[PDB]
Amino acid sequence: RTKRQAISAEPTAFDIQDLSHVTLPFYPKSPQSKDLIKEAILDNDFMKNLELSQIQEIVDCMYPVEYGKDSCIIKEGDVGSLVYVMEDGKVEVTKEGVKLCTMGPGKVFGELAILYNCTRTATVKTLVNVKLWAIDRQCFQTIMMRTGLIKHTEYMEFLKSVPTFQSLPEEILSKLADVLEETHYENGEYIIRQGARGDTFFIISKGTVNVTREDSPSEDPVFLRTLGKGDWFGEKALQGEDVRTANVIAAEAVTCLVIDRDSFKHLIAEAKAKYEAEAAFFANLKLSDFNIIDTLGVGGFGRVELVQLKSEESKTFAMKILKKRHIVDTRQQEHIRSEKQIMQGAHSDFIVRLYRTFKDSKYLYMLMEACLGGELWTILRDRGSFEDSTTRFYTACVVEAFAYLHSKGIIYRDLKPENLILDHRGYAKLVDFGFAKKIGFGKKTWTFCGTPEYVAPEIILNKGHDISADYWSLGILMYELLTGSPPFSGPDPMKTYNIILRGIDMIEFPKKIAKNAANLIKKLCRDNPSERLGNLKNGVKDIQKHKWFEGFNWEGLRKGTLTPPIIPSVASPTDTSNFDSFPEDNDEPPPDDNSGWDIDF
Amino acid sequence: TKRQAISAEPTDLSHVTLPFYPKSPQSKDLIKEAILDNDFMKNLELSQIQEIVDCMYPVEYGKDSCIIKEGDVGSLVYVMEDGKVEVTKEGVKLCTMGPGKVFGELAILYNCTRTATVKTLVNVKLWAIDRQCFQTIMMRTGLIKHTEYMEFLKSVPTFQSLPEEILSKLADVLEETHYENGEYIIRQGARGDTFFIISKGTVNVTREDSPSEDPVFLRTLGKGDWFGEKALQGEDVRTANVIAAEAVTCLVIDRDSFKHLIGAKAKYEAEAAFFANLKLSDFNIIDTLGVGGFGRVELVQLKSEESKTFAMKILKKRHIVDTRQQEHIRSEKQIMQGAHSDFIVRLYRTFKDSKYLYMLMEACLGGELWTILRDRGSFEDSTTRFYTACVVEAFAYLHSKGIIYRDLKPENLILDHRGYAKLVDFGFAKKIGFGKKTWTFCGTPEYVAPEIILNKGHDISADYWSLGILMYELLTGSPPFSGPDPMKTYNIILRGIDMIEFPKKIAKNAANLIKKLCRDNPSERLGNLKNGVKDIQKHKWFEGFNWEGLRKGTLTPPIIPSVASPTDTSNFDSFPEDNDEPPPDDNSGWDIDF
Ligand SMILES: Nc1ncnc2c1ncn2[C@@H]1O[C@H](COP(=O)(O)OP(=O)(O)NP(=O)(O)O)[C@@H](O)[C@H]1O
Ligand SMILES: Nc1ncnc2c1ncn2[C@@H]1O[C@H](COP(=O)(O)OP(=O)(O)NP(=O)(O)O)[C@@H](O)[C@H]1O
Ligand SMILES: [Mn+2]
Ligand SMILES: [Mn+2]
Ligand SMILES: [Mn+2]
Ligand SMILES: [Mn+2]
């Protein structure tokens, strides 16, 4: 027993762009010589396994060679690269000296040499004048390479054309090409019959077919359609058993590529699809498709009305409307602009979606999702204070929203119950991004903004601030939700700011606040932004890890399976019962502003 | 109730020299005291307070004039130096205010409306400063201080190594501490948790080498130097005194605040460099591990460590051009050097004179698996399961990068000294596309997949065919398809695995896997389906197998080879010396990567 020798033919660097530039020589032959070669090939144990198409390129490519009476065609020890077929004559083959075979015409020999550069095991020498056919290894692999690649890519442009097959990689689709079966039918043969159960899919590669169908059990079948090279039928079968709804009869000599479901199934994001569609709907809306039907809120910078589509009254939206003269007077152009940019680009279940903006010469219009469950501040007003477990639910929704915004480098900067709205399920979402800003990581911004009771001390002190300011506000929010009032507040803003600067540890916490809640509040309202929980290595995950949030069903909240603490009554998309009544803005409309600074609204 | 949000005007360029109004020391001390008396502004830091003091400007008002009228919008904060004013609201007199008191400071946060009227009772001298100039001070000094701080850090080796967003949090926790002349910042022998960076001044570092003698001068450290590193990794015992030589400020950080904010396998960046300065003559040949169609594989040893042995495959350059196999040797080098898998022999580097190519690889002294199979006859089911598992891992690595191996057989499986099997010989390996096919007839006859024989095109699924052959040979001592010559062997292969009567030696699960690996149609072979090679690891035969222990090298191999030394070639057959005439030279240039 001795080690086995590896062998190799010449490598290949041959692709689809080379099919047109290789050359397969053609030598004309009598039909009788072509069937002699065809029979000889089909008699060889190895070559009879090639495809009849490829066999009949080989016969066309073999060339004539004649030897006299006592000539030697193969020398033992020589290297071989040719396979031969004898036409006329007879030849005797000898090894080291023994007379081995004697073989006459119509037999293939030397065929190992079309696999690789063999050493010949015997010498074959003529006896009578012989006519041979030959093809050498290089041209045989060129046939195999060219025909195989042609057939393969032909198959894959057939599959790429089927809708059931459009959706899948180039890979995988090439295993599918290798699982096709070619089936040929003669004229009048039924490929498929109405009412038959089927598991096979058909693609017509050659010929044409007639699609007949009896509308009745006992009408005779009526003509319907004709399908040709490129058409398919039976696609229903690749998802399950298909009841064929028509006969398909071969109108001529037909070849189809056939695939059944089991071989298919052995080889087992709608993002720019789903959300691109919503974008189109909102894009071809004008301001003139809405009616104002009620008022959801009144703010410092704009009124928020409930609006209804004139053409689909199921579809209502919240519309924030801002006076342009007012935005210019308060010098808030870039704050409104970032409200638009950040809210439009945010895709968070805990942030109200901004679908688009409109504009006329007096107002800017922000069209967002309506949340008819109610403003959290009015709910806190009506109830006084929220239980520990109720506050935990709403605080968690803010925390999820902050996890999304802060991960994209965005500071929110106006947390407060007036800016938390309940949807119809009772889930809280952030509105009002008028102070939100996309800042760097590790960079700081300097605008003094917020709502006094909620402003972080580093904003008051003009020291620079970042997303950690939001965690300070989160602590204020918890304290207010749990007791009904925020911890820092005075009769005028300057007094309110001065109390904030004295810090959270100078406040006597009411006994209402559970120990874990008080602990989290104090860890969120540290004076130094670098000491605040949420601004450390693990970011917001440290807040979700606190004792107070231990036990909380974070993933039930994220998956929307968590039952909210307060279920709002919303009877219809028009139901504003969960909101206060507001009087009409009966003031004179502001001056027009066609300066152009709002070109991007 | 219900609260309204407020906002100042939003707003980098260094081009803004601040205005300066000269002031008496008395007037500058009057302004500073007033600021430090105001509940809000007393919380700003003193550096900024003296920029504000230097930047506010003088204003004079006459008798009976209003400095502020209720209802106006404010943007100025004031401090009076001389005079008296009356504060009124809706005509009611609230108070009288004298010099040295800040008022109107709400207006430096945002445009507040004034809540009261301030009217002079006499001539009045005030200082005032605008919001849109207070913001500029706070921003400028704030950004200047910040970028200065982080340029102090990053110069520290203990820092530098971590993202910038982190070090800007680190800058925000450094505490400025000032020391006067002769003050000891730190003393030798003290236990400390603080790290220091000198921002102003310089210090003398003294140290007594004895308790008996006296602290000698050692060093002088100045603006930019640091000390007390070691304290940010744990308690540091100070190795010297640091005394302030002048008025000194240092930025100080203790370990607990450091750790509260914080919380790179450059070893092949290293070991790759080492292999680069080697010449093809720093080695000795010790013996020969094998002889192949291309060339001998010799064990070679580095002259300088003798601990370090390697396998070196040597190929006759024109033997390769004779066989027209240049582009296969190119892919052997490319793929084996680029492969990083514990189940594939590493190719560290290439050499070449112009007559030979030299492939320097990891030596595996456990022995050729074919020689072990030769000596033992056949492997147990569990023994074969181990070696097949290493091949499967190797194929998982190669096939996941689009590379077909194409010469699996026991002659190409080598055991290392632990007994773990690895693939050698990548002469037929090729990086082909995904879903693409290649056409070169190559392999070893008993192992060649039928789609290679028939020239139908092949891809990595051919390796799964060979894997089934391997299992069959390991389990029985001979492969399933074999005849007295090639062509007979190839014709038997074409008749398929189901025409072979399996010996009863082969367990049912193994036979099932072999037959599932050697399907004629490559799209039917286990490993070529949706889950890829993971389907093979899922088979009944591999159920119970410790795949994760194998990958971690904790699984005990079925055969532990005796290797006494890195020079021990006992586990290999002996081969005679390469005594034929040297081949001709080849400077064609196809060996560009020598
Ligand atoms: N999308 C919405 N769905 C339901 N109610 C909403 C929505 N957006 C706003 N509101 C209500 O309208 C009020 C004013 O909206 P907001 O967007 O907060 O205006 P503003 O002028 O920015 N207020 P502020 O900036 O805090 O002074 C909110 O406080 C909510 O009560
Ligand atoms: N890294 C190695 N460590 C130890 N022994 C090795 C190593 N690589 C190869 N060998 C041995 O040397 C023999 C020849 O090496 P190989 O790399 O297989 O040469 P080849 O010319 O490609 N043989 P083949 O093409 O199959 O005829 C192998 O079969 C092993 O027995
Ligand atoms: Mn608001
Ligand atoms: Mn707002
Ligand atoms: Mn080998
Ligand atoms: Mn090899």
Author numbering:
A (entry chain A): 73 to 340, 354 to 686
B (entry chain B): 74 to 84, 90 to 341, 356 to 686
Task: Copy the relevant paper text.
PKGs belong to the AGC family of protein kinases and have N-terminal regulatory (R) and C-terminal catalytic (C) domains. The R-domain comprises a leucine zipper (LZ) domain, a linker region with an auto-inhibitory (AI) sequence, and two cyclic nucleotide-binding (CNB-A and -B) domains.
Here, we present the first crystal structure of PKG Iβ in which the regulatory domain is free of cyclic nucleotide and adopts an AI state bound to the catalytic domain. In the PKG Iβ 71–686 AI complex, the two CNB domains contact the large lobe of the C-domain while the AI sequence docks to the C-domain active site. The C-domain binds AMP-PNP:Mn2+ at the ATP site with the DFG motif adopting an ‘in’ conformation. Both CNB-A and CNB-B PBCs adopt ‘open’ conformations with respect to the β-subdomains, similar to previous CNB domain structures without cyclic nucleotide. In the R:C complex we present here, the interdomain linker between the tandem CNB domains forms a single helix that allows the two CNB domains to clamp around the C-domain. In the AI PKG Iβ C-domain, the glycine-rich loop contacts bound AMP-PNP, activation loop T532 is phosphorylated, and the DFG motif adopts an ‘in’ conformation with D517 coordinating Mn2+, so the pseudo-substrate is bound much as true substrates are expected to bind for phosphorylation. CNB-A in the auto-inhibited PKG Iβ holoenzyme adopts an ‘open’ PBC conformation typical of apo CNBs, and its contacts with the C-domain indicate that the orientation of the PBC is critical to auto-inhibition.
